Design a protein around this nucleic acid. Structure first.
Ligand SMILES: [Mg+2]
Ligand SMILES: [Mg+2]
Ligand SMILES: [Mg+2]
Ligand SMILES: [Mg+2]
Ligand SMILES: [Mg+2]
Ligand SMILES: [Mg+2]
Ligand SMILES: [Mg+2]
Ligand SMILES: [Mg+2]
Ligand SMILES: [Mg+2]
Ligand SMILES: [Mg+2]
Ligand SMILES: [Mg+2]
Ligand SMILES: [Mg+2]
Length: 117
RNA sequence: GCGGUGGAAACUACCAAGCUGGAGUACGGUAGGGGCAGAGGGAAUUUCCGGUGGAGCGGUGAAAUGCGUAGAGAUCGGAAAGA
């Protein structure tokens, strides 16, 4: 739909799922792919493999718009933080910068209590 | 045991003067999340207002309630607030 030569890839990795969004430097969203939209449900939705197919599935659409260089943003403690990165590499798209944006509060809102499990 | 009387003068007690090592005062330093009061600061989060986008998000041992086509989550820009 839009052919943008350079932009950014946001990958949020949580413990139950990982979102991979494709955007451009103007701060605008083009197309996204989630581990859940790939036909995965809750348990499997956390594994690095679903993050793999998620990243691959977004980059399908990003090469279809004909884009070349990109920055990678990784947010969150989950597993896909490593796995997704591999996909970004093997999908044959030039890797500019890979940053870790995981929000670190400098103090603040008191987190939920400890699960006694 | 109590009372009277004659002696002794070390220890406690009393009376008079002394002495610093105890306790303080002045002086000069120095470390400190000590206390009270008044200024300022940033992350993060939540909600609200927009632009993109367009099906799931969220969550568990595995699920479901819940939130979502009345456009969620994601992402960029703005405000506001408290801790
Ligand atoms: Mg889990
Ligand atoms: Mg006698
Ligand atoms: Mg005497
Ligand atoms: Mg005296
Ligand atoms: Mg105060
Ligand atoms: Mg600020
Ligand atoms: Mg649209
Ligand atoms: Mg419902
Ligand atoms: Mg409404
Ligand atoms: Mg619209
Ligand atoms: Mg949102
Ligand atoms: Mg404020």
């Amino acid at each position: 739909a839009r052919k943008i030569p350079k932009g950014v890839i946001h990958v949020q990795a949580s413990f139950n799922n990982t979102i991979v969004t494709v955007t451009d430097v103007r701060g605008r969203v083009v197309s996204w792919a989630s581990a859940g939209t790939c036909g995965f449900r809750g348990t499997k939705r956390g594994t690095p493999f679903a993050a793999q197919t998620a990243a691959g599935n977004a980059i399908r659409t990003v090469v279809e718009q004909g884009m070349q260089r990109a920055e990678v943003m990784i947010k969150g403690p989950g597993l896909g933080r490593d796995a997704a990165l591999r996909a970004i590499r093997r999908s044959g798209i030039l890797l500019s910068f890979v940053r870790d944006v995981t929000p670190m509060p400098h103090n603040g809102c008191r987190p939920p209590k400890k699960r006694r499990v």
